[PDB]
From a paper:
AMPA glutamate receptors (AMPARs), the primary mediators of excitatory neurotransmission in the brain, are either GluA2 subunit-containing and thus Ca2+-impermeable, or GluA2-lacking and Ca2+-permeable. AMPA glutamate receptors (AMPARs) mediate rapid signalling throughout the brain, and orchestrate various forms of synaptic plasticity that underlie learning. These cation channels assemble in various combinations from four core subunits, GluA1–4, with each contributing unique gating kinetics, trafficking and subsynaptic localization. AMPARs exhibit a modular architecture with a two-layer extracellular region connected to the transmembrane ion channel (transmembrane domain, TMD). The ion channel is encircled by diverse auxiliary subunits, modulating receptor gating kinetics, pharmacology and ion flux, with the transmembrane AMPAR regulatory proteins (TARPs γ2, γ3, γ4, γ5, γ7, γ8) being the most abundant.
A GluA2 mutant (F231A) increasing NTD dynamics phenocopies this behaviour, and exhibits reduced synaptic responses, reflecting the anchoring function of the AMPAR NTD at the synapse. The Phe231 to alanine mutation, which destabilizes this interface, slowed desensitization recovery of GluA2(F231A), both in the absence and presence of TARPs (γ2 and γ3). The role of B/D NTD interface stability in this transformation is supported by a desensitized (R/G-edited) GluA2(F231A) structure. The NTD dimers of the mutant receptor also transit into parallel O-shape conformations, and the LBDs depart from two-fold symmetry, which again is coupled to an increase of non-domain-swapped receptors (relative to the resting-state receptor). Rotations are larger for one of the two LBD dimers (C/B versus A/D), and movement of the B/D subunits is less pronounced than in GluA1, perhaps due to subunit-selective contacts between the NTD and LBD tiers. Transition into non-swapped LBD dimers probably involves relaxation of the critical M3 gating linkers of the B/D subunits, as observed in an NTD-deleted NMDAR structure, thereby entering non-conducting (‘deeply desensitized’) conformations. Closer analysis of the three sets of desensitized structures reveals a gradual transition of the LBD tier into four-fold symmetry, which is greatest for GluA1 and smallest for the edited GluA2 mutant: GluA1 > GluA2(F231A)-Arg743 > GluA2(F231A)-Gly743.
Author numbering:
A (entry chain C): 570 to 626, 633 to 716
B (entry chain C): 423 to 506, 511 to 520
C (entry chain G): 5 to 42, 55 to 84, 92 to 162, 173 to 210
D (entry chain C): 766 to 773, 785 to 823
E (entry chain B): 521 to 551, 569 to 618
The structure:
């Protein structure tokens, strides 16, 4: 009959849809068993149906302010730096503060330096720079 | 390069002769309000280490206050650059 | 029948130990188009040395570099150090000693159970080893006679374990009788 | 100088490795529990 | 499913069967209808999601059975999906 150990086994077996060795014989036991059977059907069917998708498997300035794990810099004395230093827009002023306060100095000393620092930071360092250089780089290995 | 070609036509249009020189500081440029020093291309031109810059140098407010730029030959904009597997227990993801 | 069982278990233990040892030793685990000592060319890779075949310098063998998330690092470590295949070989060795010591100290009839546990555990270790090896490799190809030697070692080891437990059960049945 | 530089289903064991790891680990826990009970019973024998 | 998954499914079937047999019949203090042949049948049936006709009653046997059940659920659900 169902002691605590046998009852845990009955329930586990029902959830894994792996059949039983005993089943409740009384009215109360059968009510409990019925609801557990229904729960198992809905949940297992849903697991299998969604396992029909999980089957094998940041891009704004706002997104950049959102991501604090990424540290992002500009040329140390560069028109990007000067535009951040003398900025009047809120986003760029926040970026200028982050550059001035993201320690150590996120600033690099050459554009290719910032590129390679990003290309050698596994996405933990980002570069703020002119759009032409990015277009050339994204177009070139 | 692109600016080396442009400088060739810059010299053609100006008629003058040019010597292509790089910036040692390797920076487009900016100024330290405390040292009153200019860096990179602007530092070179503000200090006379050169006389002209047909290069990817950028016009901006701070540098214009201390040196003379030309008419912008191309526009640009700031932008962001970033670095471009099933779990062991992926079977719990559904 | 009986008496033959001890011989069969002994033979099996030696065979499994030898097969697994050879497998860990040799290098024909994977036939892939990789790079020999440092183009592309078929390379019999093993647990430790990837070696070149059908090449301008075939026969040049190089130690595989198992490193270019923490899980990736831990798997790379567990695969670089073939801890699971090696543990399999060590366990098989300890099992062999237990089977051999059975002839002596025969009154204990409790060391043979130890032999069985060692053999079965060796099998489980072999399985984990195959899983990690394949997973790591995944991050056209084929498997060589070394890989299948490892598999046969697992099958024989499990059979030898079953026989050991069977004879332990018989010994206690006789003792209780 | 920008465009002319242009240079840019089966299920694998890696997907279901976790379930294999759990299976073997469980087999181990089971063998351990069994041996512990066996040792306890061996010592339990009224000497 | 890939060739490797099938190979390791077979290896695991053998392993689960051997461990269930060992864990159920090794203790002399137990002397369970779980000999090696019955163990192999229990495992095969569990994998094919069919009936059992026997279920481990001991704690250790139940641990083995539970993990084999979970493994079967994930692998067969994945085969069907």
């Amino acid at each position: 009959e169902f002691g605590i150990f046998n009852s845990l086994w009955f329930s586990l077996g029902a959830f894994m849809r792996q059949g039983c060795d005993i089943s409740p014989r009384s009215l109360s036991g059968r009510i409990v068993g019925g609801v557990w059977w229904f729960f198992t059907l809905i949940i297992i069917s849903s697991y299998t149906a969604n396992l029909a998708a999980f089957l094998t498997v940041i891009e704004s300035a706002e997104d950049l302010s959102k991501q604090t794990e990424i540290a992002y810099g500009t040329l140390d004395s560069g028109s990007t730096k000067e535009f951040f230093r003398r900025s009047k827009i809120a986003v760029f002023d926040k970026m200028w503060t982050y550059m001035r306060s993201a320690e150590p100095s996120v600033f690099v000393r050459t554009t290719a330096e910032g590129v390679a620092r990003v290309r050698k930071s596994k996405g933990k360092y980002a570069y703020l720079l002119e759009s032409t250089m990015n277009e050339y780089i994204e177009q070139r290995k | 390069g692109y600016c080396v070609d442009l400088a060739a036509e810059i010299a053609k249009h100006c008629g003058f002769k040019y010597k292509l020189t790089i910036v040692g500081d390797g920076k487009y440029g900016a100024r330290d309000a405390d040292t009153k020093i200019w860096n990179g291309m602007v530092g070179e031109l503000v200090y006379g280490k050169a006389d002209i810059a047909i290069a990817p140098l950028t016009i901006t407010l701070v540098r214009e206050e201390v040196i003379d730029f030309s008419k912008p030959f191309m526009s640009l904009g700031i932008s962001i650059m970033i670095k471009k597997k099933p779990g062991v227990f992926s079977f719990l993801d559904p | 029948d009986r008496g033959v069982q001890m011989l069969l278990t002994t033979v099996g233990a030696f065979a499994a130990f030898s097969l697994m040892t050879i497998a860990v030793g040799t290098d024909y685990w994977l036939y892939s188009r990789g790079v020999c000592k440092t183009e592309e060319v078929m390379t019999h890779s093993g647990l430790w040395r990837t070696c070149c075949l059908e090449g301008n310098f075939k026969g040049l063998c190089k130690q595989i570099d198992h490193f270019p998330d923490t899980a990736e690092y831990f798997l790379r470590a567990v695969r670089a150090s073939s801890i699971f295949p090696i543990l399999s070989v060590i366990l098989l060795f300890m099992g062999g000693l237990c089977i051999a010591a059975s002839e002596f100290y025969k009154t204990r009839h409790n060391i043979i159970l130890s032999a069985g546990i060692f053999f079965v555990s060796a099998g489980l270790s072999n399985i984990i080893g195959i899983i990690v090896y394949i997973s790591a490799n995944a991050g056209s190809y084929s498997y060589g006679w070394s890989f299948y030697f490892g598999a046969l070692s697992f099958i024989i080891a499990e059979m030898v374990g079953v026989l050991a437990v069977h004879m332990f059960i018989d010994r206690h049945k006789q003792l209780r009788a | 100088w920008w465009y002319d530089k242009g240079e840019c289903s089966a299920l694998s064991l890696s997907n279901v490795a976790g379930v294999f790891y759990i299976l073997v680990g469980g087999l181990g826990l089971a063998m351990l529990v069994a041996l512990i009970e066996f040792c306890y019973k061996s010592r339990a024998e009224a000497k | 499913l890939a060739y490797e998954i099938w190979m390791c499914i077979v290896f695991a079937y053998i392993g689960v069967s051997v461990v269930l047999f060992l864990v159920s019949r090794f203790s002399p203090y137990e002397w369970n209808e779980f000999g090696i042949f019955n163990s192999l049948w229990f495992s095969l049936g569990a994998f094919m999601r069919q009936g059992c006709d026997i279920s481990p009653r001991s704690l250790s046997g139940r641990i083995v059975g539970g993990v084999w059940w979970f493994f079967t659920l994930i692998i067969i659900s994945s085969y069907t999906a």
